[model samples]
Target: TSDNFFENELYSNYKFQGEVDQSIQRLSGSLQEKAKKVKYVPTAAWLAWSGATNEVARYLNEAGSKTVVFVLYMIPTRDCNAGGSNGGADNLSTYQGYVNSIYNTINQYPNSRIVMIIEPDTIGNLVTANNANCRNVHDMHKQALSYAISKFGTQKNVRVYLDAAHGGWLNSSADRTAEVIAEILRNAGNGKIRGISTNVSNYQPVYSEYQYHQNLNRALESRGVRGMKFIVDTSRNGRNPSSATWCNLKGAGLGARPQANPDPNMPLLDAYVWIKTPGESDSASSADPVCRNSDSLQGAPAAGSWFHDYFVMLLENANPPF
Candidate 1:
């Protein structure tokens, strides 16, 4: 495998067409062209549902020899601190089954390069939020991640990257955050992990994330883990919000386009990926207090559901203007 997983074309799944079409119809001229272009750009396929193996098979079949990016997000008590997206396998046994199925499906496509961002919010929540719900699932989260990292690590063509949340969430206490993340990576057995993924599904400027990534790498190296790379989500971080308002913010725009080895100067920075499909709602309007904040858009749908108006807003406000 090449050191850069995204050196070849990245697979753009056909599943996003319906929502893309809805947003495109609401626009005209250059903006319409811009929206249409979004369909072709590769975004990570979030394997957050039951029977996600079928979707994996479909994406792999369509991708052929091309690379496919997937987000492995269904840990037990997933999104527990948050309300709208809560729910994963009810028990450890079931969660393991889900992970195995994903592995089995990907194993069939040996020729296709696969990049997976594992379990967003799981480890980060451990360090940042210590609410009752997060506490209840703490040990279970670690066990689930350990199982997943081990299982996925076996695949030769797969490049696994663990989620390290974003700068906003973890940078407040940089040293402690790095210590906790390093411990989690150590416990999860980082032998096969290609790197860590940062700012997934959240808006944090690329430079800011790069600094945070450096801090994390330094911490990890001092703790005996070395040579960890990083991929940052540039899906909706074109414009940084004044505050750390993350849930479907009103003025968010498309950031840097997805590209492998985005910065030549920063060798450890692997890629700027669209880890979060931009039009998808961060959470349901009623999912959390942040969702209803002044910065968050109104009338947003459930967490994974498409929000047309918000999609339009992203298109119009795109930093590079598509």
Candidate 2:
């Protein structure tokens, strides 16, 4: 059992919005009966909402040793959407403070296992977008991320991953995408990076994401950046879906419940992670044409907050029926 102990291990959270399942309570407090997800620790929400530097560390502390939690938090000017995800520190010093908050939390439980994902769209869009602001965030983003890696990378219980935009956005070519992510890693101290994560919050099927990881990994290997593993967000790929109408696609069901399933093709394919916790609404259901995606009928609240009916659909539509 020790052979796959780490593989079988997964994390649950009460910190992120929309967790704490009543059915899970009915099933008891054990994560064994639920789909495990990493916690989305805050960066900007705290500035506005005001709170917890030790919040996540305490969560991880109480989560116990066997529990594994992935931490996904954003930095300044997140999503790169030209408008706003409306979170993130105002500048570098504030961002560093944000990173330090999470770091200090994780630092508390030095022996606890933690996988930290740095800035999701920051690097990917840096490479793909030539816009003025994307270009602007480039150096700041690099410095912020580098600081994160240098700080967290040294931790004995931590693994650090950068988010590579999913198959859809960076769909140019595998080699090209690899080169971009690799370059970002190089800039951030390549040797220190644990790996790249794909499909953090998208509906891409696991099989394609697996191939993307394989191709990207091999591409990294081709550049002498080998052994880089990957994690996928398997939260809602029960059916192949898209952002054409974005939000939450109507027929989208739950994908594989979070488990460390190995890809036969790529040994470096680490695990299928629910990086974007499921049942959480994508965005508030808004009729504002530019501000929202109407495809998701169940949209209830803003991005990271709870959505009750949405999760009900997720539970009933679970591919394997959770």
Candidate 3:
């Protein structure tokens, strides 16, 4: 097995900080839990949104586990006109600066592997981006993504995977979506990408995602982009969700644990990753109107804020139950 692994601060927090959830209070306050806290620092992430250039480089240089990073905050006008959680760089030039900094930082670690997933909701949601502003943003999104692929893809140890929406969305338009992806790739200067990742930050079964990926790859082949692999974000799909919607769905469970390699059944998959950390809020309850879930139990919390109950619920419903 490879020594490199993706970092999950929540798991580390529980393992190292004795930060047990209230749901686990009875089972957690154990001497064994306390014993595990004192001696090791297993992983560290470069807090990607911080206004520093070398932070990522610093962690990449020092950490033993390979880093799994997301390029979320730099997409311009993300989820355009979508009233859920919208925060990214204000404009294109600024977004490029952030991307440049991150790529530059990762480049410093030529010997260490850096697995990066680029632009989550930026492209998938573009299917409904009808306005002129959104049209412009979509073009920019493609350019930014292409720029990222070239910068990081050229690096020997930096693996780049662009987001392929998710199984659910892409399932609706697998062929058309493949065409868009092919266009994006062909124009990206280096269509020789590692692959595309799917079902990121969304709850979709791995089996279904693998099937979807195969369909997508076939479609891409038809469009003349061949030999690309895929990855699935198995972060929080342990159990099926009560709703199919993305925002703050209730009764969802943790899915497959993060793995550095694909399951044997999924030969085309590169890895089952946790691109989106579990236990982080998907969006505020105030935005439920947009999410279209009025009876949802997902409490009011910011897009990426912590929700203890949500975490507990996921743990409760975990497939390989915790």
Candidate 4:
């Protein structure tokens, strides 16, 4: 009965449970209790790499009737020379096939509520980051994302949101970022797209992100793209450090818990979601200066790998104190 996609029960991926178990075994007492709580906190499942079709099918089948949050991160030249997370479909045709496979699998699960955050960092890179690799595959990324929005957005049980980076990444140039992203969304032409997702896999405070979303929406409205909603990733933004250091931050903590329509006054803010699973390393390599900075944790594993120490830190420093 609720318009909020997150109003219903959400699916907790079994893969995440396994990771939690491993981390839980390393703790005891009150810390153990707090860590155990993580097992039940619903987080999004990534369909970022190859063989995602099979991965999606497994998660969907396991999820059954519960809502499943899926991050659609694969695109041609994904990560676009961003080193640790690079690699996606080699070309446009392959990318389409990958998206189609996901669509067909979700089609089989008609009753499950599906919420998709489509292509993190893709559109943001297109808008601001000027690298030859990203520029080279620019058109291809746009086409791939448009195809994804069209395929997934139209599903009756599915709600799609394209990634809009975070307050830190696009806030300085809000108007320009809004103009560029609005053009992209308009071109996609999918009415079923719920809105744009912000602060995915990054550490920006909730209120700051909300303010940025308001600004971005105002700009979009001026460009004829109205009523766009937003969901902010609150996974590791509990401390909300001032700097924009986005790697595995040393003192990062778990932010607000996932919830639907977190603020009724801010109607456009659809939800506060754990779009990025906490404890996962943002980068695998130390060579990336951002990852090696004093603010970033050292000895972190590859992107998406579980960082046990970081998980413990997040639990100890959780905003709500578990």
Best by TM-score: 4
- Candidate 1 residue lDDT tens string, 144-187: 87788888876888988988888888876667766765666666
The sequence of per-residue lDDT tens digits that candidate 2 reaches over residues 1-322 is 2222236445555544335343343333433244333123211111112244546655676567654545445465543433222223466687778777777777778667766776676666666766654544666676777777777777667777777878776645667767766665665552266777788667887777777776777777887777777777777777777454557566677677656645566576677666676666677777435235546664467876666566556655667655
lDDT value for candidate 3? 0.63
RMSD of each: 3.1, 5.6, 5.1, 3.0
lDDT of 3 by residue, 128-225 (tens): 44755455567667777777676766766666777888877877778887877777776667534678888878889888888999898888899987
Misplaced by over 4 Å in model 1 are 79-90, 131-133, 189-191
In candidate 1 the C-alpha lDDT for residue 138 amounts to 72
Compared with the true structure, model 3 gives a TM-score of 0.81
lDDT of each: 0.82, 0.61, 0.63, 0.84
Better of 1 and 2 by TM-score: 1
lDDT of 4 by residue, 1-322 (tens): 4556888888889988988898999998998898899888999999988787789888888888788999997775655653323333357788889888999988888888899889898877877877676654776777778888878988887999989898888887778877776666666666367889999988888888989998998887888877788999999889968577888887889988999888888788988889998988888657588987878888899988999989999998889779
Model 1 has an lDDT value of: 0.82
Order of all candidates by lDDT, from best down to worst?
4, 1, 3, 2
Clashes of each: 0, 1, 3, 1
